[model samples]
Target: YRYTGKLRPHYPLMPTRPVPSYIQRPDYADHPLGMSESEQALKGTSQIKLLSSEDIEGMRLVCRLAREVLDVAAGMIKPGVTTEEIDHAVHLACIARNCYPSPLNYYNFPKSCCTSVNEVICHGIPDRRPLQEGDIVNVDITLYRNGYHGDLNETFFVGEVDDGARKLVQTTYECLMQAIDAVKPGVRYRELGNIIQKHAQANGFSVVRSYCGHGIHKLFHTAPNVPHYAKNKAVGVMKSGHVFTIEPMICEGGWQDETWPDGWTAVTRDGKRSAQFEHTLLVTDTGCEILTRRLDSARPHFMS
Candidate 1:
């Protein structure tokens, strides 16, 4: 039977970018099945050092390039375009910018980009999986340039979908917006959980407690664990220099997740659908700035 409730990784303090000797789980995590997602989610919790003004400027350029790649990939999201095609587009886009695919070889993840179709909670490795009509897919993209990284993801509808799918996708979309709205200097970063949970529950949806946002800049995943569930003991008071993500994975069914044998894909435990939206954010002196902003009038509606 699929685990129904919260199942955190056995190692909460584990760093997302790399594993220390003690954090490695060769026993429970070494099983050739579902170890990537299972181990990273639980045992990894690493953070990167802050960026200087010049470093931040370089990151801005990298982020703009990454956004361009995401747009290129989104344009190919028709019925016949396989997920691998999208991955190729992203890989080429990053390489064209003279940068490396951040998800490649960092932790043994082979994909150049993550293309998660319907029911894929996150980290759906790019392969022969062809996207179908009436499906929603999340393209998670990250870029490494000049010793920094920018991370972002968005869920898109393949074609026409049902009302339930539409509602779930839309609601989860706004959850990120609402959470980002609360990102002010001196505002508690952990409070992101409160806003996300309250809004999601008010919409009659459940937040996937297992996955929360994290500090992202140089190291991809760092300090200040941003939980999306309500009333959790997450740390970090928001500051002007902070850069992180406030992504919430909302589910159509229960707030539980299951993994496949490939050791990376995550799906809803109830076999229901799941959706997520992400942004690389920087808390400025005033409010928050979305680094992965899209261009050319192509922007995500707060609701699906």
Candidate 2:
């Protein structure tokens, strides 16, 4: 592996946790290779799905629940907590709500959620490494309930972080919000990348290119691929009842990223810090609604 950053994969990933029989799961849940048949079939198609009124209700249910679950997993963050522990806590939290953790075993991702720390850009596999003070970690959570998939993530300061790290995280969050705020009916989807890039570059950061947000509903990853960098070739237009995510991976250094040997974790090439924020959004007739918006009781974007 290139070992792009100080963080290393804690060997001996823990065994996959179990979900109760009564709970419904995605088709890939029990597959030998964790291949999502639904996702594979939907690949290469550019059609955007508009949720009917009943389908919108289903999305609202899972997304609101997904936000609560993300907060539960994030609340356990501290200086000494291991990523594996956070993974387990998230797995349990999902089951308690009668929902399956969407990431577990999806394309062979062994954990229930993604915990990206430091230079890690996304898809970080949680392991035995204990989080250190001053470390900023991003926990990406998704839940499956009532045949719908809800997704969202946020970056948090492990303990007390320095000013530069704080600025990187704050700017990344704002980048997400800026693009999200731009989402509305009739807007070209490619314009979002430009909006995100303008803000990140002015703040001395770069947008990651490899991983882009996607339209999420019945399938975890689908059409309407969203790029976060400027002038990207992403093709689509916003419409009412279209649900998707706009997670921007902002880097403190260069934007190019390298993947770990595990094939899941992605980190910045320069080994400098990176931060990301995500939300599952639904476009409406008037504007858009953040399906995974944090509730009043959930943790704020940053600590006071």
Candidate 3:
């Protein structure tokens, strides 16, 4: 039995699509939803990788590409638009930029990007349902280019939303920002969870316990898995060259979550609203850089 929470996802999920032959693909693209030997080996390492100058440059390019595609996808959010449409638009945008859509076929995700609607905390596969008024959704975009990956996601409003959802979405973004602000040389990764958890609890929301932020770069997901709640046992410290994401999945009710039958979709077990925001980051000597930061115009105009 699947725990759907409030909204039930329409199933018999569409089959994964094929990327055009011209667009680039990741090394694992040809394999059966698994990581390569070298990638698996990288996971055993504890500390985050300090990127070289050339590696940083490569990351910047791919992160910029991810933001561009994300912007295109965000613009299409409105009543009557299907998540599949957003996925297709993002897929085309990635190809236009000559990059591979990272989420597509990774562990058999079956979509070019993830479109998590209300009640779904993360990994909501794009489907045929048209978004309705007052519904909130999260669109996650990741791109693989130049042998590196850039990941980011933003929660959006379909048309008009209630105050509860607005606050949840806004607070989740702020949680991410606060965590990022806490980053600097010599800072501990565990401190990120402390800051995020305090804010979320103070706001009367609960931080998702199961899924956490992860170190991302050349590897799609690697070491230094970051938790959003405080007092967790996540290891490692923030270094100048460490690159990771501090996404907080804030829930309107209990923090516990359950996955849908689809295997990837995660939702709040209490059937409450949830929101999330993510950014690929570069830890500098003094602070951090938001690699997936949106431009002024690219920002979504939320319907309060």
Candidate 4:
């Protein structure tokens, strides 16, 4: 994810913009595939693609470390913790690993990780926003290690979220895990989109079309753009040497999205909330390997 595609100097914090209403219950609970808010706005970009075999192994370690950071950082997420504190947590963890936070200077993003709150889809600049109860936040963490970079992110519920947000979170993860399962050595790249779109549509949600996964190797961004929705013209045939990320950004309403004025945050165009899940994978000879896989952190699924 291009959380920090390019960086700009952080202006003084605005007068604490009101948290969007879509985060509230009953009012924003039910999804509106048939409705469009056109009220809120957002800004940003992401480049998802494939990686080579040698690049895959190198990125694997990087992703594992990023996951570790997320797991640890997530533990610290609570009512009183500030977003900047979370950024500090990520920075300390990366420095301890002797790995650099990919977002810190790459393009000059001021923080180690992106902490997007409520409607602030992705690339939310870490600041003094003290997380409150019932807020859903997306923490994007990418790292550079051994000359390679690993990128991944997930939306987590602060304290306890409403049913609407919870549904979006669980469903988004289901789409991502299912899409990851469809990746194999012989599978076509286009099929990944097909599976993801089908699963998302079945659940009455739309997959964000503007942002997709990309190639990760030496640099932060590269080839084989990986779209989350179906029937995309993304290139590259799935081969044993190919490694890539399949992180889908699923929204509660239409897939159409917008970027924030800050130029780094992204959000749903309809203002109907959004959720995402990401993972880096390797196309093995027989199947694919999830380099960012975890032991207790099972991939999410819909509650049914």
TM-scores for the candidates: 0.83, 0.98, 0.95, 0.80
lDDT of each: 0.73, 0.91, 0.86, 0.70
Stretches > 4 Å off in candidate 3? 296-304
Ten-residue segment with the worst summed lDDT in candidate 3? 295-304
**Which candidate has the highest TM-score of all?**
2
Ten-residue stretch with the least lDDT total in model 4 = 34-43
Global fold similarity of model 3 (TM-score): 0.95
Residue 191 in model 3: lDDT: 85
- Measured on C-alpha atoms, candidate 2 has an lDDT of 0.91
- Tens digit per residue, CA lDDT, model 2, 251-276: 99999998888888899999999999
RMSD per model, one decimal: 8.0, 1.2, 1.7, 12.0
What local lDDT does model 2 show for residue 254?
A: 94
For candidate 4, the TM-score is 0.80
| Candidate numbers sorted by lDDT from highest down | 2, 3, 1, 4
What lDDT tens digits, residue by residue, belong to model 3 across residues 30-94? Answer: 77864455577785777679999998999889998999998898789999998988999998899
Q: List the candidate numbers ranked by TM-score, top first.
A: 2, 3, 1, 4
